mmCIF file of C-alpha atoms in Angstrom:
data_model
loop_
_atom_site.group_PDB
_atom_site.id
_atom_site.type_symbol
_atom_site.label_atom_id
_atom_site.label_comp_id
_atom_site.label_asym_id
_atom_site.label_seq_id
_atom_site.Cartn_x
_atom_site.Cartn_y
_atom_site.Cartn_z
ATOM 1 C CA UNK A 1 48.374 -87.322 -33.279
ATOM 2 C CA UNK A 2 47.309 -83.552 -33.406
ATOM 3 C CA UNK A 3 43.140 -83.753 -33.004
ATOM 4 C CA UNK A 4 40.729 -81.742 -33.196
ATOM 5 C CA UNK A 5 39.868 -79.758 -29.867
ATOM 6 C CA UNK A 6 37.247 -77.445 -28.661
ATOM 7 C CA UNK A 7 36.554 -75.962 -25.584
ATOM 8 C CA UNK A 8 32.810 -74.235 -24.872
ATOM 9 C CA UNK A 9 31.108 -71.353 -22.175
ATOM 10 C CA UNK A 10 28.444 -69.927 -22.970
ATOM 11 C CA UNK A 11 29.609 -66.351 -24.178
ATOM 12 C CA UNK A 12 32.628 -66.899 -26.249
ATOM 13 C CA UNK A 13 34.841 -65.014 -23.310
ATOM 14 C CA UNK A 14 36.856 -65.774 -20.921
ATOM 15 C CA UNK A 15 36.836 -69.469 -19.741
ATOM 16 C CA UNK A 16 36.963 -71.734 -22.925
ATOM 17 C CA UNK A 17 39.082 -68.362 -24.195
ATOM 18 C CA UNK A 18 41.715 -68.518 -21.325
ATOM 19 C CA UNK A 19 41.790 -72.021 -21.922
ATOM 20 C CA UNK A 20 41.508 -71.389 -25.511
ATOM 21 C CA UNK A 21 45.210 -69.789 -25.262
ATOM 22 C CA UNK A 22 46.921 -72.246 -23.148
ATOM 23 C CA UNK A 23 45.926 -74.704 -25.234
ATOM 24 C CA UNK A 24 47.169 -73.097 -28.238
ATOM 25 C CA UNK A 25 50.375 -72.459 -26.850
ATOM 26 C CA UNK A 26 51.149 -75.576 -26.338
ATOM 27 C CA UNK A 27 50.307 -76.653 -29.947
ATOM 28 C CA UNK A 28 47.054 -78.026 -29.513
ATOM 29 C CA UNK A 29 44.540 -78.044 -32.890
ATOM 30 C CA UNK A 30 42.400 -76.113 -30.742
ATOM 31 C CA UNK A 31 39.423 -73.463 -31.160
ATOM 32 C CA UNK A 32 36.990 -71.536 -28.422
ATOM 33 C CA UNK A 33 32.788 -71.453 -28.380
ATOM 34 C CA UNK A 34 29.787 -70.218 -26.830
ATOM 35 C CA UNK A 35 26.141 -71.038 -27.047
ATOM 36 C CA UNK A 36 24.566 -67.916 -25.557
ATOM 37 C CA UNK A 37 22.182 -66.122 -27.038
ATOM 38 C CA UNK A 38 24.529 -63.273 -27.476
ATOM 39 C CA UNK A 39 27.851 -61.973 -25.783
ATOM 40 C CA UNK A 40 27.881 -60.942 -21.975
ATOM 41 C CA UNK A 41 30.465 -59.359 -19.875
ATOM 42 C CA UNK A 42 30.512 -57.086 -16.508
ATOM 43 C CA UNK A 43 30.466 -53.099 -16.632
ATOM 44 C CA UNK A 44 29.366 -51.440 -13.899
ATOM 45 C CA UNK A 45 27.782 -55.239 -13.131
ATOM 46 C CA UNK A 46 25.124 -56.852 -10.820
ATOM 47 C CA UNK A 47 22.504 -54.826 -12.525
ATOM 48 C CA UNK A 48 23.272 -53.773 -16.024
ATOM 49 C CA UNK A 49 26.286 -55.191 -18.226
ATOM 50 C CA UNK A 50 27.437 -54.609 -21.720
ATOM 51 C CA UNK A 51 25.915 -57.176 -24.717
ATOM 52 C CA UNK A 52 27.193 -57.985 -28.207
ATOM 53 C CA UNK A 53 26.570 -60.239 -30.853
ATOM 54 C CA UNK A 54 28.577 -63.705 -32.210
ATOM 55 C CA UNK A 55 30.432 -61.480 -34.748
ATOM 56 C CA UNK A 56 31.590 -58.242 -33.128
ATOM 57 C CA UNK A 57 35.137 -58.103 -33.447
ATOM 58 C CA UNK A 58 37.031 -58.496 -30.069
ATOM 59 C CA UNK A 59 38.940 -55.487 -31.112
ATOM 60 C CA UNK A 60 35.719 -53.482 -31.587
ATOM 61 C CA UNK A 61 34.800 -54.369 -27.558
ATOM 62 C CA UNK A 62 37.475 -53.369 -26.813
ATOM 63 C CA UNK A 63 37.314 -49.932 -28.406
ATOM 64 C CA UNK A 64 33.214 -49.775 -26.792
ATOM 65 C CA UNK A 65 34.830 -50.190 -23.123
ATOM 66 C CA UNK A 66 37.192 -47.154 -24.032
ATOM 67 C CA UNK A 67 34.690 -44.801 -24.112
ATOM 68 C CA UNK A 68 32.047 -45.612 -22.053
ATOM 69 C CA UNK A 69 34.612 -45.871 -18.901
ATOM 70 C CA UNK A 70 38.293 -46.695 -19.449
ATOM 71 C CA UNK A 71 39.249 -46.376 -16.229
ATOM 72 C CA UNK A 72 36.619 -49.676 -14.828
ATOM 73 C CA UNK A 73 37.398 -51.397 -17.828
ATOM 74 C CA UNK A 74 41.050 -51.562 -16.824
ATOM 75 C CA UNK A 75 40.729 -52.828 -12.926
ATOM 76 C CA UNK A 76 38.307 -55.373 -13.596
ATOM 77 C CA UNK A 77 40.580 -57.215 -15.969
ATOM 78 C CA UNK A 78 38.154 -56.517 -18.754
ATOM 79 C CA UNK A 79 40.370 -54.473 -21.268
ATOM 80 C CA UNK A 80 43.420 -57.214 -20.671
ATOM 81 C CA UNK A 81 40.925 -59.745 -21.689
ATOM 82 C CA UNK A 82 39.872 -58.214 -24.669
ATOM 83 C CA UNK A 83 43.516 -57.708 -25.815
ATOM 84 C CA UNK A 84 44.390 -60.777 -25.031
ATOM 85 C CA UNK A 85 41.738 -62.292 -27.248
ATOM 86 C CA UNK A 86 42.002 -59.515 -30.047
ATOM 87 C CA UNK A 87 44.855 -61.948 -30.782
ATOM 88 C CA UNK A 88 43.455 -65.505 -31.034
ATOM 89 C CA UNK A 89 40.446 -65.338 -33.110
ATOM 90 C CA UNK A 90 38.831 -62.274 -35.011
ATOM 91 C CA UNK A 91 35.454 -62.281 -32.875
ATOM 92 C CA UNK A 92 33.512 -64.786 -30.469
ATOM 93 C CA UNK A 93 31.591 -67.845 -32.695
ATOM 94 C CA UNK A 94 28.483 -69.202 -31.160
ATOM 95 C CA UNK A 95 28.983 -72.939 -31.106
ATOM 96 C CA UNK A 96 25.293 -74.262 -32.419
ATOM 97 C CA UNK A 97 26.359 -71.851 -35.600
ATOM 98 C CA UNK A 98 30.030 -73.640 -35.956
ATOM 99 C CA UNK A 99 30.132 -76.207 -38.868
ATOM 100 C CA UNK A 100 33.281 -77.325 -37.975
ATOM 101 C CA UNK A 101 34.222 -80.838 -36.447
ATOM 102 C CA UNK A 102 36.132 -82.292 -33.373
ATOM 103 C CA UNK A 103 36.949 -84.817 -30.993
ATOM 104 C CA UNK A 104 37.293 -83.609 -27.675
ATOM 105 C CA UNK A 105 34.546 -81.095 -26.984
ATOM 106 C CA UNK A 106 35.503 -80.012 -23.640
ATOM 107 C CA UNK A 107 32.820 -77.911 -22.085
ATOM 108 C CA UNK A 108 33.122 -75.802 -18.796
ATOM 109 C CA UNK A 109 29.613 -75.496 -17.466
ATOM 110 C CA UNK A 110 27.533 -78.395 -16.376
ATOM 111 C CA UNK A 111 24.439 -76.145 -18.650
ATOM 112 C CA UNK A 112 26.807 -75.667 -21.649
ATOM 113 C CA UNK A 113 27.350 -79.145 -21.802
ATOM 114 C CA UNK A 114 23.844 -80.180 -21.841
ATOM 115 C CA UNK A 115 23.235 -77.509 -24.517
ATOM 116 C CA UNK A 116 26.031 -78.652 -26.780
ATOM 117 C CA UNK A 117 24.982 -82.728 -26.631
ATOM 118 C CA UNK A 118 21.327 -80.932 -27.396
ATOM 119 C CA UNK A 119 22.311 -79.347 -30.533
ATOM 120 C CA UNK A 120 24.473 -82.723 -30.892
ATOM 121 C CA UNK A 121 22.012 -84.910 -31.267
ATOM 122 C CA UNK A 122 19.892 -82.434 -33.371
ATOM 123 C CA UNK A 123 21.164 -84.033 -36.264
ATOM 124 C CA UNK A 124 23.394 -86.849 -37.935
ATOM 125 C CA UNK A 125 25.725 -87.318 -40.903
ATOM 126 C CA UNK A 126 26.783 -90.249 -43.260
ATOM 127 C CA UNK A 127 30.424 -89.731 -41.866
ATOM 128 C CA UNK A 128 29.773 -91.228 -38.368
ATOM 129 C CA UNK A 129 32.326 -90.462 -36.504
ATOM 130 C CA UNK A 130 32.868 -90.087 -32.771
ATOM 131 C CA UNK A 131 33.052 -87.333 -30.662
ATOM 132 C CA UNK A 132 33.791 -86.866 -26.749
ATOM 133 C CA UNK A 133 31.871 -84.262 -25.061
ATOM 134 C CA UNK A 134 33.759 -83.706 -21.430
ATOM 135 C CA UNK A 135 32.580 -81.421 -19.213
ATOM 136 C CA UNK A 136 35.126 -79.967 -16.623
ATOM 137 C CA UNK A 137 33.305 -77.559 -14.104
ATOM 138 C CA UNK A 138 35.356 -73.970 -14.266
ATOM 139 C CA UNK A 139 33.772 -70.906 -12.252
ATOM 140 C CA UNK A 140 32.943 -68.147 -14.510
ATOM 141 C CA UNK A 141 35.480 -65.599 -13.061
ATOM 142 C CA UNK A 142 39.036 -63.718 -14.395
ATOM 143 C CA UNK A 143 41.121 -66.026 -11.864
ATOM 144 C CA UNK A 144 39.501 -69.865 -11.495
ATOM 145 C CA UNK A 145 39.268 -69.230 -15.347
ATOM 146 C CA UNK A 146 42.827 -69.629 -15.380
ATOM 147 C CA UNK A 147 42.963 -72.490 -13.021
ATOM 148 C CA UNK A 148 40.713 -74.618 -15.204
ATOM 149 C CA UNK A 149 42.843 -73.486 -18.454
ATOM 150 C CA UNK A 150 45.049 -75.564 -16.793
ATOM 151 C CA UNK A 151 43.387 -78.172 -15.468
ATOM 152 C CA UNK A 152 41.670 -78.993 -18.509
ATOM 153 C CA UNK A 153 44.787 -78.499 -20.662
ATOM 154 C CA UNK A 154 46.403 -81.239 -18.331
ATOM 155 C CA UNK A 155 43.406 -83.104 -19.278
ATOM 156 C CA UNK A 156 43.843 -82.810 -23.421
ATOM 157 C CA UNK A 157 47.567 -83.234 -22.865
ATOM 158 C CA UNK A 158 47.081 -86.599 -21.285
ATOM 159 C CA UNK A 159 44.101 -87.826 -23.863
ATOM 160 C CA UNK A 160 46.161 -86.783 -26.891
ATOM 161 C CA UNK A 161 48.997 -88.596 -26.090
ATOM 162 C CA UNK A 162 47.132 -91.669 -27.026
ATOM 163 C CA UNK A 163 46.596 -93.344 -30.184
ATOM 164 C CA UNK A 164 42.854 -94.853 -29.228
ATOM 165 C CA UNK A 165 41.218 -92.321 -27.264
ATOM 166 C CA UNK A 166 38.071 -94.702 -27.543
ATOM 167 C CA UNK A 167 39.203 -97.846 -26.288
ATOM 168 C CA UNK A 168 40.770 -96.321 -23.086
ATOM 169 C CA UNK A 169 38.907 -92.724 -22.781
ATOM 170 C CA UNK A 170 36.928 -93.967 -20.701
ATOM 171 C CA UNK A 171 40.200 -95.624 -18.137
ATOM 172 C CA UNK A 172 41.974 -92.097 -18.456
ATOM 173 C CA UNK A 173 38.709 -90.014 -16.987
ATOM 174 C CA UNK A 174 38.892 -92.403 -14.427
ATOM 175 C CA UNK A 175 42.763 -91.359 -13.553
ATOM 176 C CA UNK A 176 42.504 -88.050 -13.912
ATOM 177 C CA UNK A 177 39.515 -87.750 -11.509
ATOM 178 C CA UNK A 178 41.845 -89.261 -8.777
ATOM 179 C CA UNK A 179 44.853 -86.520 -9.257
ATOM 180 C CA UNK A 180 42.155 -83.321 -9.606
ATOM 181 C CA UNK A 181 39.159 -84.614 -7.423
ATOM 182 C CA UNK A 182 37.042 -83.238 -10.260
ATOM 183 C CA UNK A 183 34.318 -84.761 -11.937
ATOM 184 C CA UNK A 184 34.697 -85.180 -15.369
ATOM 185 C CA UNK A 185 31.153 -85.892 -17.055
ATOM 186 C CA UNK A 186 31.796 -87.342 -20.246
ATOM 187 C CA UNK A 187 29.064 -88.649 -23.275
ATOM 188 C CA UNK A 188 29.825 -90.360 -26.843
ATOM 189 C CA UNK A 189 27.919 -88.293 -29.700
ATOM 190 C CA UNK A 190 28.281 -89.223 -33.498
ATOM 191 C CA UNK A 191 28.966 -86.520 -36.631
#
């Protein structure tokens, strides 16, 4: 009863990565996505940011930030991110790239998803085998990011501890929308 989870943003950051941890933590088969173009972050932000690519080694962002400006870098969260990631996963994957299967695809942008059940569909397999795409809204910021870590690991929690997600998927969105007042789009897609 350990499945396959994945949680998606758009750069490979901080809200599928905070969310990436808690789930982790508590066991969970879990692994973290984006499906920008390349990486994004603030730095002297609202007019020009830092960019990297799919690859770059969390620990070599880290080191960047150092130089250009420490001192930001430590305020805005930033470095603490970094660190904290340096530890999960080498560097940021881009999801579209991944070649690696799930069954919860839990997404946190109401774009993202759209972009993931895209590059879904953009294909098929002679494995057929299902896969739930749920997107869970999650502001793109150091703090709500947390929030929705939670929220959405409350969410896996609850799905996991099932034996037929398929059969009664679909009756659990419907309770958990009533205890978070979220909305919890959801869509079938086939490996």
């Amino acid at each position: 009863s350990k499945l396959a989870v994945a949680v998606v943003c758009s750069s490979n950051m901080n809200r599928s990565m905070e969310a990436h941890n808690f789930l982790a933590k508590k066991g969970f088969n879990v692994r973290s996505y984006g499906t920008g173009e390349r990486v994004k972050l603030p730095g002297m932000a609202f007019d020009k940011p830092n960019v990297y690519e799919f690859g770059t080694k969390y620990e070599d962002i880290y080191r960047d930030l150092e130089s250009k400006d420490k001192e930001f870098y430590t305020q805005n969260g930033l470095l603490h991110m970094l660190d904290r990631n340096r530890r999960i996963k080498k560097c940021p994957e881009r999801f579209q790239d991944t070649k690696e299967q799930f069954d919860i695809i839990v997404t946190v942008e109401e774009r993202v998803y759209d972009l993931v059940v895209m590059h879904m569909e953009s294909m098929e397999s002679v494995d057929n085998r299902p896969v739930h795409v749920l997107n869970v809204d999650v502001v793109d910021n150091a703090e709500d990011a947390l929030m929705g870590a939670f929220v959405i690991t409350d969410m896996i929690n609850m799905m996991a501890k099932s034996t037929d997600l398929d059969n009664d998927i679909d009756e659990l969105i419907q309770e958990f929308e009533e205890r978070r007042k979220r909305v919890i789009l959801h869509s079938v897609l086939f490996y």
